[PDB]
Amino acid sequence: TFGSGEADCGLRPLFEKKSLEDKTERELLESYIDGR
Amino acid sequence: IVEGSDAEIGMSPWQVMLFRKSPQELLCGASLISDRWVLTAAHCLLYPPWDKNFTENDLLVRIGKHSRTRYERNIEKISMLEKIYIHPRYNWRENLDRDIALMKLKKPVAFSDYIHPVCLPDRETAASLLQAGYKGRVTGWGNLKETGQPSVLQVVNLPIVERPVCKDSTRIRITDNMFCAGYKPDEGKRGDACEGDSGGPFVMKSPFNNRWYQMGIVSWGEGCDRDGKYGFYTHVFRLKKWIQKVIDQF
Amino acid sequence: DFEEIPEEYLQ
Ligand SMILES: NC(=[NH2+])c1ccc2[nH]c(-c3ccccc3O)nc2c1
Ligand code: NA
Write a three-state SS string for chain B.
CECCEECCCCCCCCEEEEEECCCCEEEEEEEECCCCEEEECHHHCEEHHHCEECCHHHEEEEECCCECCCCCCCCCEEECEEEEEECCCCECCCCCECCCEEEEECCCCCCCCCCCCCECCCHHHHHHHCCCCCEEEEEECCCCCCCCCCCECEEEEEEECCHHHHHCCCCCCCCCCEEEECCCHHHCCCCECCCCCCCCEEEEECCCCCCEEEEEEEEECCCCCCCCCCEEEEECHHHHHHHHHHHHHC
- Which among A1, A8, A14 has CB closest to B10? A14
Under DSSP, is residue A16 helix (H, G, I), strand (E, B) or coil?
helix
- Which among C3, C9, C10 has CB closest to B69? C3
Residues lining ion ligand 2 (Cβ < 5 A) are: B 182, 229
Neighbours of B152 (CB within 10 A): 16
Residue B45: which residues within 8 A CB-CB, separation 6 or more? B52, B53, B54, B59, B84, B86, B101
* Angle, CA A28 vertex, CA B26 and CA B229 arms, to 5°: 60
Q: What is the CATH number of the domain that holds A31?
A: 4.10.140.10
Instruction: Report how far residue B83's alpha carbon sits from residue B126's, in angstroms, rounded to the nearest whole number.
Output: 28
Instruction: Report how far residue B15's alpha carbon sits from residue B35's, in angstroms, rounded to the nearest whole number.
Output: 13
Cβ(A28)–Cβ(B136) under 8 Å? yes
CA distance C11 to chain B (A): 10
Instruction: Report how far residue B23's alpha carbon sits from residue A8's, in angstroms, rounded to the nearest whole number.
Output: 36
Instruction: Report how far residue A31's alpha carbon sits from residue B137's, in angstroms, rounded to the nearest whole number.
Output: 12
A1 CA from centroid of ligand 1 (Å): 29
What domain count does chain A have? 1
Instruction: Report how far residue A6's alpha carbon sits from residue B116's, in angstroms, rounded to the nearest whole number.
Output: 10
Instruction: Report how far residue B58's alpha carbon sits from residue B103's, in angstroms, rounded to the nearest whole number.
Output: 13
Cβ(B175)–Cβ(B233) under 8 Å? no
- Give, in order, the Cα–Cα distances in Å from B166 to each of A4, B131, B134: 28, 14, 15
Experimental method: X-ray
Overall size of chain B counted in residues: 250
The ranges assigned to domains in chain B are 1-12+118-237, 13-117+238-247
Residue B218: which residues within 8 A CB-CB, separation 6 or more? B29, B41, B138, B140, B193, B197, B198, B199, B200, B201, B202, B231, B233
Give the structural domain span for A14. 1-36
Catalytic residue among B12, B43, B97, B197: B43
Answer whether B244 sits within 8 Å of A32, measured CB to CB: no
Chains A and C are touching, with contact defined as 3 or more CB–CB pairs separated by less than 8 Å: no
In CATH, B1-12+118-237 is 2.40.10.10: yes
* Angle, CA B140 vertex, CA B125 and CA B228 arms, to 5°: 75
Question: Residue B186 catalytic?
Answer: no
Burial call B80-106: b when 16+ CB within 10 Å, e when fewer: bbeebbbbeebebeebbbbbbbbbbbe
Cβ(B18)–Cβ(B68) under 8 Å? no
- Give, in order, the Cα–Cα distances in Å from C10 to each of B20, B24, B83, B126, B170: 10, 10, 17, 39, 41
What is the CATH topology of the domain spanning B13-117+238-247?
Thrombin, subunit H (2.40.10)
